[PDB]
Design a protein around this nucleic acid. Structure first.
Ligand code: ARG
Lengths: 95, 5, 78, 97, 728, 108, 93, 105, 86, 97
DNA sequence: GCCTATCGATGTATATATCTGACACGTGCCTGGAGACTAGGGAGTAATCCCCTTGGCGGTTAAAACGCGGGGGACAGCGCGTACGTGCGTTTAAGCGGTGCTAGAGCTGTCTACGACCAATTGAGCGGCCTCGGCACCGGGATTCTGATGGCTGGA
DNA sequence: TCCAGCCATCAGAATCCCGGTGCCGAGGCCGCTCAATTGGTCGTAGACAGCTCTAGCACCGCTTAAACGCACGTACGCGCTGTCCCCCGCGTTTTAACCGCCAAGGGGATTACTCCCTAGTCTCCAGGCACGTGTCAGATATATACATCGATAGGC
């Protein structure tokens, strides 16, 4: 009866990108909606401890990159930082 | 004598 | 009501865990550890329910109860 | 005929490691939750998805605890897990001191 | 009294010799007695033995025994476990020595040659510490601290050196330990020593200074310009109160451990009729000093004329050393006393002393507080505070120059090199100003065009902003490879590296002939540069040129650093070059072994240049010192020189104008490539050299900034984009 | 005014930069949220979701299904040693466990 | 420059519990950091509880329910009684 | 009289805790009773630990609470050790505990 | 020479130091292979802790690794350290 | 000569070092090892005197807890000597990869 | 045979004597806490619709319980040797300190540009509905381990 | 000639796989409404520069506590053997879980009004932090005493 927002539609687009033929059940959506929410609350949680130790008041892409660097293990960090840098460059370079 | 003989 | 965790039920749990042989006293220790684990999680669940001024204990509250102790569970909403 | 001791155990290991179904029965585990919540607030009401959220957090905890118990029992050069194996795993994990 | 037997001490010996040796055959006392039963042996000629006899516990090196080493096991001597260590260390030893480079093998051979001589030198006595007189002739050996002092029956030492030692033994019974103006400035060189005639005129005047100062009662700071006046004139002045006046109080000289051997060698060569308690060693050594040599005659009738102690030991035993009313306290390298917070300064102040002398090897130019501290130490009175001093030290006054470092009654000699030296040929600072190479021009253009966005601020810029740019451009005064090294695939080919060197480095074209001309003559070279990385390039370049060379910077460990300096300073040194640094000037090193020096780099402080020259301008040099400085018509140091000469990087407007005037017009002009302004190789620069004793958009060719902004936006975009969306 | 164009479309991402910006500003993580922060955060989230979906689908093809089920995500996460180090404390409902038997227990 | 710390207040509590005992410099640093960490735990749990119920204010009820969650059984009962004593006195005075 | 600590009967700073809650970005609002509640909890927890550490100081016959007097307090109490279980205390040492099987007989 | 500058620095946690740490825990007999395992474990512990401290230092645009950075590196991994700041 | 039996000196060291809170690892070589690992991540790093102090306190406390767990693991196998497999089992139970 | 007896060390533990450096206390003041006020809106409360939890029932049948045989693993006992401990010896370098230098952490005063707040309007994403294909359930047989039984022959 | 390592064949019981057939759960799709984006402005944060001084790295010399090496021997890890009952596999009787259906009402999720507590800001005054200072507490040395432990000797 009331709008309850979720990451189903965007994760579905990502699935239809990496695997155009596969589908995803209604319960893997709940895992997907929870995984993204958990990673959000972890990275943005660190980006709140950072920019408080430094006495800043704003969360920036640099602090989000530092949170990703601290949080994701091994090779997952490099690709995550690379994808974030690509998105930032494409946003700043175009309208 | 102290020396070694 | 704890003895409703039947002896075969504990056996099946051990098989999933890789246990080949089970001693006859594992069952009571398994029951006590499960009672302790539930007394930890359900206490937090009731605490969240009391704070919300609610009577029905919800899945969101239970996943918060596991989230405070670091057993994050995916599939329900937390 | 009769299979020798161990053959059925390994068959059960593979069957229950392949499957994703829950192992503790739903209703006699639901009643145990109701009984533990009795001591904290009377006239409580439990959702199905919160009794099931407790079930899938109980089973996946004993299963990993039982894996640690098996590791500790193999350490002592034994095949059978014992109460002294559960207590050592739970003392090393930090749940008991 | 006596004690029990059966203990080994130490294994430092290895030899090959004939069987049947007994006693101490090769020792001097046994050589006189038996010659040698091993004499005439050869390693292969006779069935001999490879010995490694042992230094024995409770007995000295003079008692070092040689025997058939089978007897050692035959006596069940404790401590055989050190024997097993000796083989394993020796077995490791040959595995390195047989395979190392011949230069290092011969280096280790020299290290062995120093080693056994140091070991041989332990045998010689220095003094017996006076039922037989002072019973059993308690004595010191050379090298060992006082802890190892031991006894002799008078049966082997009585023969070797007791003939002259008895004369020192007799010296024990010898009696030892304000007036008007004195008839100074005579010729007393006969009192100097048994060849004591070498005192020059200026050294004599320094002695005449010190005597005049005490006749006035004043104290002295020996501010000699790091010449020979450190030791020779200092020790001789103490003869004034002893050998002329016999007013011989107790004298203290606190010298650093590095220079203690020199001070202890020249206190005997000069002023030989003196005694000297070296107050070194562990607590046992100093305990032996106090009980046995500190007061021979009776209570508080000291028998030491001079004692040498390190600054480190003076702080440990401050009580015992400070309890005597000193006639003289001497401190060498006294720039350690430049700070009143120093514990040595605070503890040496409280020493009651009749006269005080400080020896320094710097012009002590530092601010008023350093002088105020030094003046306070020599004279504790009439110089106590700024309130009674502001009328005189008040700077900013041209009439004040009549007193600043002029009107100082606690006189310092400050006697410069120019006053003492009277036969040195004239000197000219060679400045090899030249055009820029093509590679340098491109890299110089690369740096400047990169930093346009910072330079646009002008007066609103940052001093630290410019300084980075100027520091970066100085890498273009140095050769290119500090900015971007050459390609390894081509640089490694020595068939092409020679062409690479000569084409890139025009700076060597004239030096090449000088190198050959002076190598045939036998000269040596020292090279100075600020950039340690640029020094690395020189080390690699020198390794390619295969001239022998040394290096001196702050990253080298102490033992290797000292040996590298000693290798170049040794008699007949063969090493040709030396990578030097300015900071080495405070160590008192000697540069007289090399008469040719190249100032490759430039520096912003003329004091560093003075420190480099001060260690080379040694008194007594007969040759004309060869010095060359390099200028490349860019990063103009002459913009500083024309201003500096009125008083010999300070003003924001000036520094911005330096970039606007330095390389004002010869930017990347449309004149094109392959300009190659090389055509002044030889005999052009020699004859024509002089000698002596707009906003940026208006300036820079902004067309390039398009060519950089549109290419850097490409370099720093693929570096973002060149990584897969996904792993694998 | 000019026709609208979502921030997600400018950066190329599929994840909502608008929603991430709102969550970062109505969640009291900091007093200000940079304009470059939601774009970065969505990029990381999109990448992790893509990686997990790729491994889950790769296990789905092995299991002969065409829909991703909970079991495959457990197979995906636990086999990849890096995603397992991120989700070690995580429990996946209906996920099961990795098929593994200790070699001491196997018959001989 | 001022590095504000719980140093003055720990001493007051110590002087009330053991009037003769004192506290060392490094033990003060532990006690200062102990205050800060249990501060941050209760505040973070209070923040999340407020967010979970779509609430914007952190109240005594939020702090009480976070203490009941973080502290053990008897420490929770003692702390809640002390907290309810302080708040009830502050509304009266 | 004009301080919130004196109104609550509290020794810890009500006002500073209010500042840290507001300036720590926990929520958009901090109730007027939250700082009083939190400071009261902070003081009690410190009072308990200080009491146990002073008891250990008296048992060790000293006068000053040093880090091992805090460590001996936290680990002995079953509840404080559960609160500070992951906590490492600098210069705190470990409690004497030799397993019964290692002592000889 | 008997020793070289070849980054063997982890061998400066000697047999005695590992033995004392075990003796504080309660260990009575130590096998000869415990030391290499302790050295391997200690390097792994330090690598993770030092990396987080270096990440915080780099974020701060700073070049000196501080006690506060080390405490924040430990606080992430559930190993809270009291004594140096907060 | 008087000589204690194997075990007596072991217990006294247990008693002495459990009572004392002093550092066991030497400061200077631990500081050198810290700088070595850090230089792999960012060169030219300076370290405050307290940063190495904080690292050493954490490192020693971690090892002592690891040694307690290792001793308990060994005893479970009815032994007295700790072995590398005990360390491996303790780490695996604790959850370190 | 195994028990327990006094004794010769030799490390803790306990005293009493020095003394240094660190804590509790002092004053000053600057920054922050507080008082008095006004303003918008968040949370309280009453009313309300109905989602869904709970209570009951009755088949079905799957899985739980209980008992029997037998085997294999637990665990006590013994023995053999590789390994750790204790200790004396001795060579490396930690620790202390003193002194020095200069890089880089902290702060202040300035300016700007980047984010929040604001009013509008527009389509991207939510809810409800629908309809087809994947797989859920199922009969079935090709396949694959597995325990019993008949079969060489090694070192002995 | 034998126990045991290495096999062959087989009847039985599994799990696997294929063809088959229903259903319900996804994958689209239509309409809509809340929120995201666009345009403008204001002001406060952070970026930058110019600066001072705390403290980190570095050298060098003492000193001695502690690392390192080796060596005897004694206690413990590790294999092996035996035996004894704890567990497993299984057949069969048995309990109750599961599901489909039924009806009741509890309290969850909202909507809407209103008003009290809380943000923002200004004047205010006093508290707590910083710097200084000095006396005493517990660190150290040393000394005697008091255990704790283990070699050697006699009793039963
Ligand atoms: N276990 C404790 N914390 N004991 C200390 C006393 C606690 C409480 N005050 C009672 O009495």
């Amino acid at each position: 009866k009331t709008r309850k927002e979720s990451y189903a539609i965007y994760v579905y687009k990502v699935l239809k990108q990496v695997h155009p033929d596969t589908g995803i059940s209604s319960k893997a959506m709940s895992i997907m909606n929870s995984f993204v929410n958990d990673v959000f609350e972890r990275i943005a949680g660190e980006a709140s401890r950072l920019a408080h130790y430094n006495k800043r008041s704003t969360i920036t892409s640099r602090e989000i990159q530092t949170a990703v660097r601290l949080l994701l293990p091994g090779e997952l960090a490099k690709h995550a930082v690379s994808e974030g840098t690509k998105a930032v460059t494409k946003y700043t370079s175009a309208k | 004598a102290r020396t070694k003989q | 009501n704890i003895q409703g965790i039947t002896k075969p039920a504990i056996r099946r749990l051990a098989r999933r865990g890789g246990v080949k042989r089970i001693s006859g006293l594992i069952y009571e220790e398994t029951r006590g550890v499960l009672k302790v684990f539930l007394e930890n999680v359900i206490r937090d669940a009731v605490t969240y329910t009391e704070h919300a001024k609610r009577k029905t204990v919800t899945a969101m509250d239970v996943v918060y109860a596991l989230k405070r102790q670091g057993r994050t569970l995916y599939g329900f909403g937390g | 005929h009769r299979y020798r001791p161990g053959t059925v155990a390994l068959r059960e290991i593979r069957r229950y490691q392949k499957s994703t179904e829950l192992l503790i029965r739903k209703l006699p585990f639901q009643r145990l939750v109701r009984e533990i919540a009795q001591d904290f607030k009377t006239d409580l009401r439990f959702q199905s998805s919160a009794v099931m959220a407790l079930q899938e957090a109980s089973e996946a905890y004993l299963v990993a605890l039982f894996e640690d118990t098996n590791l500790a029992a193999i350490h002592a050069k034994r095949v059978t897990i014992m109460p002294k194996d559960i207590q050592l795993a739970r003392r090393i994990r930090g749940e008991r001191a | 009294e006596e004690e029990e037997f059966e203990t080994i001490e130490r294994f430092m010996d290895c030899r090959i010799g004939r069987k049947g040796a007994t006693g101490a055959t090769t020792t001097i006392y046994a050589v006189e007695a038996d010659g040698d039963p091993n004499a005439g042996f050869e390693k292969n000629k006779e069935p001999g033995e490879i010995q490694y006899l042992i230094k024995w516990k409770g007995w000295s090196h003079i008692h070092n025994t040689w025997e058939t080493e089978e007897t050692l096991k035959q006596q069940n001597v404790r401590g055989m476990k050190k024997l097993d260590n000796y083989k394993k260390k020796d077995q490791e030893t040959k595995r390195w020595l047989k395979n190392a480079s011949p230069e290092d093998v011969e280096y280790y051979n020299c290290q062995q040659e120093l080693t056994d001589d140091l070991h041989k030198q332990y045998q010689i006595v220095e003094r017996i510490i006076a039922a037989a007189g002072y019973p059993d002739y308690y004595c010191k050996w050379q090298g060992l601290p006082y802890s190892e002092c031991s006894w002799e029956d008078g049966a082997l030492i009585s023969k070797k050196f007791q003939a002259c030692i008895d004369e020192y033994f007799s010296r024990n019974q010898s009696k030892t330990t304000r007036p008007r103006f004195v008839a100074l400035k005579k010729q007393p060189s006969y009192i100097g020593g048994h060849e004591g005639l070498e005192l020059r005129d200026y050294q004599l005047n320094g002695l005449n200074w010190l005597a005049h100062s005490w006749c006035k009662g004043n104290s002295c700071i020996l501010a000699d310009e790091m010449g020979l006046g450190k030791t020779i004139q200092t020790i001789s002045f103490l003869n004034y109160l002893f050998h002329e006046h016999q007013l011989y109080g107790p004298f203290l000289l606190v010298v650093p451990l590095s220079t203690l051997t020199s001070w202890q060698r020249e206190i005997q060569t000069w002023a030989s009729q003196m005694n000297a308690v070296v107050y070194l060693g562990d607590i046992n050594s100093r305990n032996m000093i106090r009980t046995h040599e500190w007061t021979h005659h009776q209570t508080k009738r000291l028998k030491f004329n001079i004692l040498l102690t390190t600054y480190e030991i003076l702080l440990k035993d401050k009580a015992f050393l400070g309890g005597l009313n000193w006639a003289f306290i001497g401190v060498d390298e006294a720039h350690r006393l430049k700070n009143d917070d120093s514990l040595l300064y605070k503890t040496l102040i409280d020493f009651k002393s009749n006269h005080r002398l400080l020896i320094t090897g710097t012009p002590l130019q530092n601010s008023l507080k350093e002088l105020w501290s030094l003046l306070h130490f020599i004279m504790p009175e009439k110089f106590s505070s700024w309130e009674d001093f502001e009328e005189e030290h008040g700077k900013g006054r041209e009439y004040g120059y009549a007193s600043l470092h002029k009107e100082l009654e606690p006189f310092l000699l400050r006697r410069v090199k120019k006053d003492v030296e009277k036969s040195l040929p004239a000197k000219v600072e060679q400045i090899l100003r030249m055009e820029m190479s093509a590679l340098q021009k491109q890299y110089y253009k690369w740096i400047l065009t990169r930093n346009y966005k910072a330079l646009s601020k002008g007066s609103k810029g940052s001093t630290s902003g410019f300084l980075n740019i100027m520091m970066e451009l100085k890498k273009c005064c140095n050769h290119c490879y500090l900015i971007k090294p050459p390609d390894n695939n081509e640089f490694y080919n020595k068939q092409e590296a020679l062409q690479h060197l000569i084409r890139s480095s025009g700076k060597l074209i004239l030096l090449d002939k000088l190198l050959i001309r002076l190598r045939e003559r036998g000269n040596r070279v020292l090279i100075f540069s600020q950039m340690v990385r640029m020094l690395d390039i020189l080390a690699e370049y020198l390794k390619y040129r295969q001239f022998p060379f040394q290096r001196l910077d702050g990253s080298i460990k102490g033992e290797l650093r000292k040996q590298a300096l000693d290798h170049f300073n040794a008699e007949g040194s063969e090493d040709f070059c030396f990578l030097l640094s300015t900071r080495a000037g405070g160590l008192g090193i000697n540069l007289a072994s090399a008469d040719t020096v190249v100032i490759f780099d430039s520096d912003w402080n003329p004091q560093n240049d003075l420190q480099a020259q001060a260690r080379a301008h040694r008194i007594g040099q007969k040759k004309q010192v060869n010095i060359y400085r390099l200028v490349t018509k860019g990063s103009v140091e002459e913009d500083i020189l024309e201003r500096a000469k009125k008083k010999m990087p300070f003003n924001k407007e000036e520094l911005s104008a330096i970039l606007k005037f330095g390389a004002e017009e010869l930017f990347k002009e449309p004149e094109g490539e392959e300009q190659e302004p090389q055509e002044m190789d030889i005999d052009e620069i020699l004859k024509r050299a002089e000698t002596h004793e707009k906003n940026w958009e208006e300036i820079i060719p902004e067309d390039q900034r398009r060519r950089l902004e549109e290419e850097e936006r490409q370099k720093e975009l693929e570096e973002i984009y060149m990584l897969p969306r996904m792993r694998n | 005014r000019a026709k609208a164009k979502t921030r997600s479309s400018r950066a190329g991402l599929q994840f909502p930069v608008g929603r991430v910006h709102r969550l970062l500003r109505k969640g009291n993580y900091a007093e200000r949220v940079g304009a470059g922060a939601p774009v970065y955060l969505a990029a990381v989230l999109e990448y992790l979701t893509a990686e997990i979906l790729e491994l889950a689908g790769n296990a789905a093809r092995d299991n002969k299904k065409t829909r991703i089920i909970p079991r495959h995500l457990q197979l995906a996460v636990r086999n990849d040693e890096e995603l397992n180090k991120l989700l070690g404390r995580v429990t996946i409902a209906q996920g099961g466990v990795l098929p593994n038997i200790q070699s001491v227990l196997l018959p001989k």
